[PDB]
Amino acid sequence: GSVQIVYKPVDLSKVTSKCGSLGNIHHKPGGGQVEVKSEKLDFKDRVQSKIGSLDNITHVPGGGNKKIETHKLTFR
Amino acid sequence: GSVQIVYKPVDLSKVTSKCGSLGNIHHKPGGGQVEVKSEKLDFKDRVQSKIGSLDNITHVPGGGNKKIETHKLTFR
Amino acid sequence: GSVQIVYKPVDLSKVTSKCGSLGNIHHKPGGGQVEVKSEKLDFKDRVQSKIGSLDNITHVPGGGNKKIETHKLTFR
Amino acid sequence: GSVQIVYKPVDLSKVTSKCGSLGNIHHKPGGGQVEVKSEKLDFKDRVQSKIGSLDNITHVPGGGNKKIETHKLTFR
Amino acid sequence: GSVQIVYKPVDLSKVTSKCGSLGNIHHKPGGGQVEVKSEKLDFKDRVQSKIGSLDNITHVPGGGNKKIETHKLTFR
Amino acid sequence: GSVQIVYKPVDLSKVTSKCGSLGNIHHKPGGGQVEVKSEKLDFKDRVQSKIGSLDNITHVPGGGNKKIETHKLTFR
DSSP: OOEEEEEOOOOOOOBOOOBSOOOOBOOOOOOOOOOOOOSEEEOOSSOBOOBOOOOOEEEOOSOOOOEEOOEEEOOO | OOEEEEEOOOOOOOBOOOBSOOOOBOOOOOOOOOOOOOSEEEOOSSOBOOBOOOOOEEEOOSOOOOEEOOEEEOOO | OOEEEEEOOOOOOOBOOOBSOOOOBOOOOOOOOOOOOOSEEEOOSSOBOOBOOOOOEEEOOSOOOOEEOOEEEOOO | OOEEEEEOOOOOOOBOOOBSOOOOBOOOOOOOOOOOOOSEEEOOSSOBOOBOOOOOEEEOOSOOOOEEOOEEEOOO | OOEEEEEOOOOOOOBOOOBSOOOOBOOOOOOOOOOOOOSEEEOOSSOBOOBOOOOOEEEOOSOOOOEEOOEEEOOO | OOEEEEEOOOOOOOBOOOBSOOOOBOOOOOOOOOOOOOSEEEOOSSOBOOBOOOOOEEEOOSOOOOEEOOEEEOOO
């Protein structure tokens, strides 16, 4: 029983961008407040907890062009 | 039982960017406050906890062009 | 039972960037405050805890172009 | 405004007993077992707790004649 | 405003007993076992706690005749 | 405003007992076992704690006749 696989993907894909000018970006929130309360925590597996974050983020890239791929060949 | 696999992906993909000027980026939040309260914690496996963060981030790259890939060939 | 694998990925992918000028980036938060309270902690495996961080980050790279890959061939 | 109280209770009450013979009293339980489990306890006032008793009592008095009273005169 | 109180209780009360013979009292339990488990305890006032007693009592009085009283006159 | 109190309780009360013979009192429990487990204790006022007693008591009085009283006159 001969088995033959030829996994040969091609890609020629350009992600481009042009922006004239980034500027005058203000970010001035008026504060904030968090409060959490509990008694016991029992974690057991691959838990990803977050309890009480107060983020403030200003993310100004001149690019930002993302390109994700994923290849998975499986055999049994 | 002959088995033959040819895993041969090609990629020619350019991620480009052009930005004229980055500037005048202010980031002036008015403070903040967090409060957490608990009694006991029992962790057991691959836990990723965070309890009470107060981040402030200003991330201004002139690029930021990300490109992620992943290849996984499996055989049994 | 002959088995033959040819894992031969090619890549010619350029990640480029052009930015005219980075400048005048202010980052002036108005302080902050954290408070955490607990009694006992029992950790058991590969725990990644963080309890009460107060980060302030200003990350201004002229590049920032990331490119991640991952190859994994497995055989049994 | 004259006020006059005359609190004058009388009592002539006899509590008697006659028993011919006390004897041959066996008390042979086959053991026992208790198990309690909790995390936190917060008590705050005039609490009367009991957690996990395993009493075995043999109380053989030749008398046992109890006589309780209570008098309370109150004025405002 | 004349006020007159005459608190004059009388008591002639006899508590008697007669028992011919106390004897042959066995008390042979087959053991026992207690187990308690907790994390934290916060007590705050007039608490009367008991945690895990294993009493065995044999109380054989030839009398046991109790007689309790209580008088309380109050004025304001 | 004349105030007159006459607190004059009388008592002629005899507590008697007669027992022919006390004897042959065995007390042979088959052992026992206690186990307590905790982390922290915070006591704050008039606490009466007991944690893990294993009493064995044999109380054989020929009398045991108790007689308790209590008088409390209060004025304001």
